């Protein structure tokens, strides 16, 4: 198996691969979240250099993880699908064992844990 | 057990080891497996000790009653009585018996009666667990019309080898000589026969 430590510390104490991943996020289309007194609203930018698009079938920017939680993102689109899939699987697994849907904090903690794991695992960016 | 009976010029000689077994334990190291059913009709016993004793006792009774009415029975007759008991009760018996006797008309005769209760008249017979190891030796060394001393040596050497290889055989070598002269008992101890 491919083992290379890709995410490593530099002399100044930075992990450049993690910091360069943040640059990919900075390149991505803008996403915003605002929560009110009785709701949360997720807004997302879609770039207009793409005309002749089919908006019926094109992947939406906001994804349902469960019937009560949603996930939007900024950065690499292909990367986000992997996180969304894992989150959706964990959502159903939680319902199965705890007999209760995930809290938003728990679902977030899981997704964040996955992201962290990819910063000190060999062979992955 | 290792047993045998061998006809020769003057009559017949029976031979046997002296081991009784109860698993790998020797319950009796000085057993007498050569048994009188009539004055000059004897048998070698192999298989179950209880079965062969019970059979021999019944045969002795039958021949004693035969003698009271019709005089001395033939060796063939004695073998027929053994057969009748062994054949008809084959399901409940474990008895391998060699019958040997001396007539004056018929001289020495040997009949072997295996597990099924069949009868086989032979010049000599071997039986018991230890016999397996001396089929080769006995076939190569047996001759008809041997002398008394030759026949004693043949049995001694044969049973010596049977005893050597068979764990279920051992102790002393007993022998019974049946001739016109009478009945002679012989015994041979380990210190003699082991170093043959």
């Amino acid at each position: 198996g491919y083992d290379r430590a890709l995410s490593i510390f530099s002399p100044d104490g930075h992990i450049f691969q993690v910091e360069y991943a943040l640059e990919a996020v900075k390149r991505g289309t803008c996403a915003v979240g605002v929560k009110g007194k009785n709701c949360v609203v997720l807004g997302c930018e879609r770039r207009s250099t793409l005309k002749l698009q089919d908006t019926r079938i094109t992947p939406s920017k906001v994804s349902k993880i469960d019937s009560h939680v949603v996930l939007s993102f900024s950065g690499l689109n292909a990367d986000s699908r992997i996180l969304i899939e894992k989150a959706r699987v964990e959502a159903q697994s939680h319902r199965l064992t705890l007999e209760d849907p995930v809290t938003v904090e728990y679902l977030t903690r899981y997704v964040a844990g996955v992201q962290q794991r990819y910063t000190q695992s060999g062979g992955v960016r | 057990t290792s047993i045998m009976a061998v006809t020769f010029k003057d009559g017949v000689i029976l031979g046997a080891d002296s081991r009784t077994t109860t698993g790998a334990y020797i319950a009796n190291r000085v057993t007498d497996k050569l048994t009188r059913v009539h004055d000059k009709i004897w048998c070698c016993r192999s298989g179950s000790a209880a079965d062969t004793q019970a059979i021999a006792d019944i045969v002795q009774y039958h021949l004693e009653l035969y003698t009271s009415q019709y005089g001395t029975p033939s060796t063939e007759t004695a073998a027929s009585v053994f057969k009748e008991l062994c054949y008809e009760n084959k399901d409940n018996l474990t008895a391998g018996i060699i019958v040997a006797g001396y007539d004056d008309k018929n001289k020495g005769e040997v009949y072997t009666i295996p597990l099924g209760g069949s009868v086989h008249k032979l010049p000599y017979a071997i039986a018991g667990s230890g016999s397996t190891f001396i089929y080769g030796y006995c076939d190569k060394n047996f001759r008809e019309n041997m002398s008394k001393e030759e026949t004693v040596d043949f049995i001694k050497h044969s049973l010596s080898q049977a005893i050597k290889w068979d764990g279920s055989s051992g102790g002393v070598i007993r022998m019974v000589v049946l001739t016109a002269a009478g009945v002679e008992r012989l015994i041979f101890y380990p210190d003699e026969y082991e170093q043959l």
Binding site: - | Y25, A27, N28, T31, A49, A50
Partner: protein
Amino acid sequence: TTIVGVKFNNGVVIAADTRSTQGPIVADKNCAKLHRISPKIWCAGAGTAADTEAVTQLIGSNIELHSLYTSREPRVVSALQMLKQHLFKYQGHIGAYLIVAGVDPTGSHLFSIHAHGSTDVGYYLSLGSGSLAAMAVLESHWKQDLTKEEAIKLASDAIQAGIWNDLGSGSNVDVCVMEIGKDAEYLRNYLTPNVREEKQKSYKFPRGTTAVLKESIVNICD
């Protein structure tokens, strides 16, 4: 059980231990394994306890009737023949393993009988679960032309080997000496090398310790 029989100069001696077991538990620490078939014919029994006692009594009963019928003292070979033919008939289901010994007009005799009905002759024999421990001693110390006192010593030593080394055997040594021309002498508890030590404490309870619900006089009279 450990039982033995030993022939000597002018007769025969038999001996036995006095433990009876049920599984790993000791039921009787002093049972009698030496049985009287006739006044001068005794037998030592191992195996199923009820079988040895019952078969010993039945043949003993028939031997007495036979003795009265023939106006003769009973012979050991008659007891031997009657026992073996009875045991053989039952194909080993009557689990009696016996050492038969005694004196009669023919002389002194020593035999053993197995449950399936086979018999053996010998100058020294041993049966039971401790027979190997006993036979080891007999094979080591037996000789031809033993005296009375030597045979008793050898027999009881053989039983002791069973008592100490076999878990099936224990407690005491019983002996019976059958000498020609004399009365048979039964020596109950000839050796008692397993006396219980003094207990550390008396467990006598204060009177009233046990709670009682009802009392009543029981009528045993007519």
